[PDB]
Scaffold this active site. Sequence first.
Site, PDB file in Angstrom:
ATOM      1  N   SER A  44      24.804  15.462 -14.763  1.00 22.99           N
ATOM      2  CA  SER A  44      25.449  14.196 -15.096  1.00 22.99           C
ATOM      3  C   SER A  44      26.372  14.293 -16.301  1.00 22.99           C
ATOM      4  CB  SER A  44      24.427  13.079 -15.347  1.00 22.99           C
ATOM      5  OG  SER A  44      23.815  13.218 -16.623  1.00 22.99           O
ATOM      6  N   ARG A  69      28.054   7.261  -1.908  1.00 22.70           N
ATOM      7  CA  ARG A  69      27.042   7.612  -2.889  1.00 22.70           C
ATOM      8  C   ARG A  69      25.790   6.756  -2.762  1.00 22.70           C
ATOM      9  NH1 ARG A  69      29.879  11.499  -3.792  1.00 22.70           N
ATOM     10  NH2 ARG A  69      30.694  12.163  -5.831  1.00 22.70           N
ATOM     11  N   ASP A  81       9.240   9.297  -6.333  1.00 25.99           N
ATOM     12  CA  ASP A  81      10.076   8.119  -6.512  1.00 25.99           C
ATOM     13  C   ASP A  81       9.495   7.375  -7.710  1.00 25.99           C
ATOM     14  OD1 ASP A  81      11.338   5.633  -6.350  1.00 25.99           O
ATOM     15  OD2 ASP A  81      10.942   5.376  -4.207  1.00 25.99           O
ATOM     16  N   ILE A  82      10.315   7.107  -8.722  1.00 22.86           N
ATOM     17  CA  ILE A  82       9.828   6.455  -9.928  1.00 22.86           C
ATOM     18  C   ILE A  82       9.251   5.074  -9.594  1.00 22.86           C
ATOM     19  CG2 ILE A  82      12.054   5.430 -10.575  1.00 22.86           C
ATOM     20  CD1 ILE A  82       9.350   6.974 -12.915  1.00 22.86           C
ATOM     21  N   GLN A  94      25.746  13.738  -1.875  1.00 22.43           N
ATOM     22  CA  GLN A  94      25.882  14.074  -3.285  1.00 22.43           C
ATOM     23  C   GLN A  94      25.031  15.260  -3.730  1.00 22.43           C
ATOM     24  OE1 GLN A  94      24.807  10.764  -5.850  1.00 22.43           O
ATOM     25  NE2 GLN A  94      25.921  11.771  -7.529  1.00 22.43           N
ATOM     26  N   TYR A  95      23.769  15.270  -3.325  1.00 27.73           N
ATOM     27  CA  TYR A  95      22.885  16.335  -3.765  1.00 27.73           C
ATOM     28  C   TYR A  95      22.628  17.343  -2.661  1.00 27.73           C
ATOM     29  CZ  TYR A  95      22.248  12.833  -7.388  1.00 27.73           C
ATOM     30  OH  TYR A  95      22.460  11.894  -8.367  1.00 27.73           O
ATOM     31  N   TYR A 126      25.385   3.998  -4.254  1.00 26.36           N
ATOM     32  CA  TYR A 126      25.158   3.431  -5.576  1.00 26.36           C
ATOM     33  C   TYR A 126      25.082   1.910  -5.528  1.00 26.36           C
ATOM     34  CZ  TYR A 126      26.692   7.828  -7.852  1.00 26.36           C
ATOM     35  OH  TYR A 126      26.856   9.108  -8.315  1.00 26.36           O
ATOM     36  N   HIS A 144      21.072   4.659  -8.581  1.00 26.65           N
ATOM     37  CA  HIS A 144      20.595   4.900  -7.230  1.00 26.65           C
ATOM     38  C   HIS A 144      19.731   3.750  -6.733  1.00 26.65           C
ATOM     39  CE1 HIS A 144      22.196   8.869  -6.639  1.00 26.65           C
ATOM     40  NE2 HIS A 144      21.660   9.315  -7.760  1.00 26.65           N
TER      41      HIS A 144
HETATM   42  C1  LIG Z   1      23.192  12.029 -11.382  1.00 30.51           C
HETATM   43  S1  LIG Z   1      21.536  12.754 -11.342  1.00 30.51           S
HETATM   44  C2  LIG Z   1      21.220  12.953 -13.108  1.00 30.51           C
HETATM   45  C3  LIG Z   1      19.993  13.824 -13.360  1.00 30.51           C
HETATM   46  C4  LIG Z   1      19.687  14.089 -14.824  1.00 30.51           C
HETATM   47  N1  LIG Z   1      19.283  12.869 -15.513  1.00 30.51           N
HETATM   48  C5  LIG Z   1      20.913  14.648 -15.492  1.00 30.51           C
HETATM   49  O1  LIG Z   1      21.497  13.991 -16.355  1.00 30.51           O
HETATM   50  O2  LIG Z   1      21.323  15.762 -15.183  1.00 30.51           O
HETATM   51  C6  LIG Z   1      20.510  11.330 -10.918  1.00 30.51           C
HETATM   52  C7  LIG Z   1      19.104  11.765 -10.509  1.00 30.51           C
HETATM   53  O3  LIG Z   1      18.382  10.614 -10.113  1.00 30.51           O
HETATM   54  C8  LIG Z   1      17.400  11.058  -9.204  1.00 30.51           C
HETATM   55  N2  LIG Z   1      16.816   9.903  -8.512  1.00 30.51           N
HETATM   56  C9  LIG Z   1      17.433   9.086  -7.607  1.00 30.51           C
HETATM   57  N3  LIG Z   1      16.557   8.137  -7.220  1.00 30.51           N
HETATM   58  C10 LIG Z   1      15.380   8.329  -7.868  1.00 30.51           C
HETATM   59  C11 LIG Z   1      14.164   7.661  -7.849  1.00 30.51           C
HETATM   60  N4  LIG Z   1      13.950   6.589  -7.082  1.00 30.51           N
HETATM   61  N5  LIG Z   1      13.155   8.130  -8.653  1.00 30.51           N
HETATM   62  C12 LIG Z   1      13.333   9.230  -9.462  1.00 30.51           C
HETATM   63  N6  LIG Z   1      14.535   9.892  -9.479  1.00 30.51           N
HETATM   64  C13 LIG Z   1      15.544   9.437  -8.700  1.00 30.51           C
HETATM   65  C14 LIG Z   1      18.185  11.999  -8.308  1.00 30.51           C
HETATM   66  O4  LIG Z   1      17.328  12.821  -7.537  1.00 30.51           O
HETATM   67  C15 LIG Z   1      19.055  12.733  -9.323  1.00 30.51           C
HETATM   68  O5  LIG Z   1      18.480  13.980  -9.699  1.00 30.51           O
END
Ligand SMILES: C[S@@+](CC[C@H](N)C(=O)[O-])C[C@H]1O[C@@H](n2cnc3c(N)ncnc32)[C@H](O)[C@@H]1O
Length: 255
Positions: free
Chosen positions: A26, A168, A99-100, A7-8, A170, A121
């Site tokens: 998004s 994905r 990572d959050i 995806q990324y 997801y 995710h």
């Molecule tokens: C679909 S993108 C949306 C990004 C942004 N919020 C936007 O609307 O453009 C989802 C984001 O979640 C981030 N992400 C995935 N897992 C994460 C995690 N564990 N902690 C922080 N960010 C995460 C990804 O790197 C990605 O940039």
Amino acid sequence: KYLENNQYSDEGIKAYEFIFGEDYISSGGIIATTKILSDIQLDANSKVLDIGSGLGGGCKYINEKYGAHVHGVDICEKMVTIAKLRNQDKAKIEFEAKDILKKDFPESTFDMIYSRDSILHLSYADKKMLFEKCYKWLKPNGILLITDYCADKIENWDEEFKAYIKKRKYTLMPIQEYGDLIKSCKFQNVEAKDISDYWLELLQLELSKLEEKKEEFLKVYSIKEYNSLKDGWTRKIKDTKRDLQKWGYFKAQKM
Ligand SMILES: C[S@@+](CC[C@H](N)C(=O)[O-])C[C@H]1O[C@@H](n2cnc3c(N)ncnc32)[C@H](O)[C@@H]1O
């Protein structure tokens, strides 16, 4: 039996910006962001956390609209580097690559915790852990505001949707179940709403603009990336119409 870019991937990120608009990767880009924040109250002294801050569009918008301090966290360092580069002139915006789930903040740090299509995710167990953290991190009367992909019950999934979810990585659950998880973490005034009809409108608009600009897209990106985007939006439109893939809106308060 093909190798599909994740995806990324380098090209994937650029293609998402093409279809969603500059600074966004998004649903609905700046249009949906404007609408989602249209009843949100913040000021120049507010502290906001953006979970999954991506290329920084949301942080940029929130700081521009309210003058608020915004802290974006994203696990993807490459995106964080881009977000920082693009917002150097904004002293009250900061971004961090982490990572959050591995982040801590003090109790009562944020007036608002905001997340747009990022919590998908996380596994169910990780969503719960995150919401418990968010509850702690919010100030009293602080707001949690989320959009996220959701789904019908797994037994209604078909082959293509299952392949998509697997690809994905997801973890998608139904809207009510997502709301109940938030409630179980002690959040109050919980609103858990299916906004899939608005999502449908955004998907249709996004696809129509992509198709309008096919020749422009093909000057810089691959026709495979083009057909991948186009087919992906086509499937999302179809699957939201039959209530399989859903867009969820969640708002909650620490009381
Ligand atoms: C679909 S993108 C949306 C990004 C942004 N919020 C936007 O609307 O453009 C989802 C984001 O979640 C981030 N992400 C995935 N897992 C994460 C995690 N564990 N902690 C922080 N960010 C995460 C990804 O790197 C990605 O940039």
